[PDB]
Design a protein around this ligand. Sequence first.
Ligand code: HEM
Length: 153
Amino acid sequence: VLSEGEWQLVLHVWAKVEADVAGHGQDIWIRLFKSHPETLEKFDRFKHLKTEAEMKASEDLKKHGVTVLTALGAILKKKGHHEAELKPLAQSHATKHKIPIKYLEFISEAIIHVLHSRHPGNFGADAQGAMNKALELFRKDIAAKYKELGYQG
Ligand code: HEM
């Protein structure tokens, strides 16, 4: 469980992210796909992108980034009360997409890296600690659901 103070640090930097969701979405995707190329193989819709240049030019990838960050933003705003939001997300990623927990760790690392680069003033050590805790909470809960749904992860 996070304290209200930790949630405040998380929502304060997220408010900056919301000033440009599409842009943050792109940086995160490109960071992830370059650092862990294996994750790209999970998207039959994007697996054909070969360079950073092609990724940045993809309108579909941009749109998808917005969908993903909007869903994550909805979860963070719940401040730990996200049971309802996690069920459909867990079912699709465990049953249809088959995304192991390891990949959720990779995208978590990408989010922290992008926020550190674009918002140093609102992402000091304490804020990063709060965001890491919020993302670990998210992963822990998704993992528990995975098990209940019959997927190891
Ligand atoms: C921050 C964590 C994540 C969130 C909040 C999230 C959210 C979403 C949402 C909302 C969708 C569309 C609706 C749905 O299918 O449920 C989606 C689709 C998908 N996600 Fe995620 N996702 C996350 C992480 C990942 C990761 C790490 C991978 C793979 C390495 C992944 C793979 C997929 C795939 C393959 C689709 C289908 C894309 C398509 O063909 O249109 N997701 N995700």
